[PDB]
């Protein structure tokens, strides 16, 4: 119903309602490309993706319905949010573009911090956020898996938002994912926070590690070589004989490596950076956590909706998994 019009942008017509204005390409890529705009009607300056060849495939079309899924899904101040999708497409017989529309974002965790210790205090608010969106993200039984600075974006007044991408490295992702054992823990998530915490309090990359290897090498620096009661769980022959043929090595003592923190900060860091991911903290306990105190509200660190994630079990065809992204375009309804 809104009324649509047409403009030749990054090489392709994009045909999007009049309320979007003044639109220009940001980026793009294999996935699509994006356009800054000016949304008349909310007065938000805004990102248009329109994604690349949606339904091309089984495979694009299931990661169509996945994407939009999830971004219809998240609300929450501290992650990425959706403010529209639409298709200029009058019908599903005609249905073949899907724009997605979200807050622009200008600047990401980096572009704060510029290789700079950040203050204790701005520590403390900026991992805050980080860990309540986190929460949340869990309580819908998602695990990032990759969270970084990059996928953090942060706007003029510090707020954060947890994304699923790079604005337009492994150094902090966790050991288990690094060897590629399955079966992951949401602490997953909770080692990147740690490795982005420890960079925010002292300025340098926690684990610069050069290549795969070597990024084991310096975690094992830190946190120690296996325990015991880690090496209990440890299935895989092959790991468990050349984890037993190391070179033990004790944790280091986090009070003398992060000399000068503030000792709630290291206390946390010893909670979020431990190799057992059973015996790593969760995000809600984190956010309980006394260095916290300024920020934390117990009653304003909300949790998901339940998420059906069944369809990604489901072999469908090309066809159905259009037919199903169409039904959730139709059903869209706008945030206050
Ligand atoms: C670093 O400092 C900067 C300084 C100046 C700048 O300007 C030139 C910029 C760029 C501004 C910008 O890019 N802003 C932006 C982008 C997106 C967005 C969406 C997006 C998502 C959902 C929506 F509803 C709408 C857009 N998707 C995306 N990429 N997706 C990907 C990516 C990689 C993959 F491998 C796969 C997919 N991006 C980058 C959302 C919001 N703001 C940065
Ligand atoms: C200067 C550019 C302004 C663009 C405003 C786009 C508003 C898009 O929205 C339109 O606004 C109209 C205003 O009369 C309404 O009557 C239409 O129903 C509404 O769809
Ligand atoms: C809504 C954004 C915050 C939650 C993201 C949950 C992502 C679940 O899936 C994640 O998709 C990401 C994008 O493909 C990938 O970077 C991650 O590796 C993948 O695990
Ligand atoms: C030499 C490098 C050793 C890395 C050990 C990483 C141990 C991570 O911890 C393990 O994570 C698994 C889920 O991924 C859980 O099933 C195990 O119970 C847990 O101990």
Partial sequence: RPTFYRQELNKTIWEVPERYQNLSPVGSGAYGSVCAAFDTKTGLRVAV??????????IHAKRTYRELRLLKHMKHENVIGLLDVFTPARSLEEFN???????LMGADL?????CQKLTDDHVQFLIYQILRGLKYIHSADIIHRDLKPSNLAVNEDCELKILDFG?????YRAPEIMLNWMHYNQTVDIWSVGCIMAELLTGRTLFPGTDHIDQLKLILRLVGTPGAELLKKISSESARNYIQSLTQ?????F????????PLAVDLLEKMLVLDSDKRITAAQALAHA??????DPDDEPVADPYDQSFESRDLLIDEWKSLTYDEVISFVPPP
């Fill in 97 to 103: 573009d899907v724009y997605l529309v979200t807050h």
């Fill in 167 to 171: 604005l337009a490295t492994r150094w």
């Fill in 255 to 262: 009070a003398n490596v992060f000399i000068g923190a503030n």
């Fill in 249 to 253: 090595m004790p944790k280091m003592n």
């Fill in 110 to 114: 980096n572009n704060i911090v510029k």
């Fill in 291 to 296: 260095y916290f105190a300024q920020y934390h």
């Fill in 49 to 58: 993706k329109k994604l690349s060849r949606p339904f091309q495939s089984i």
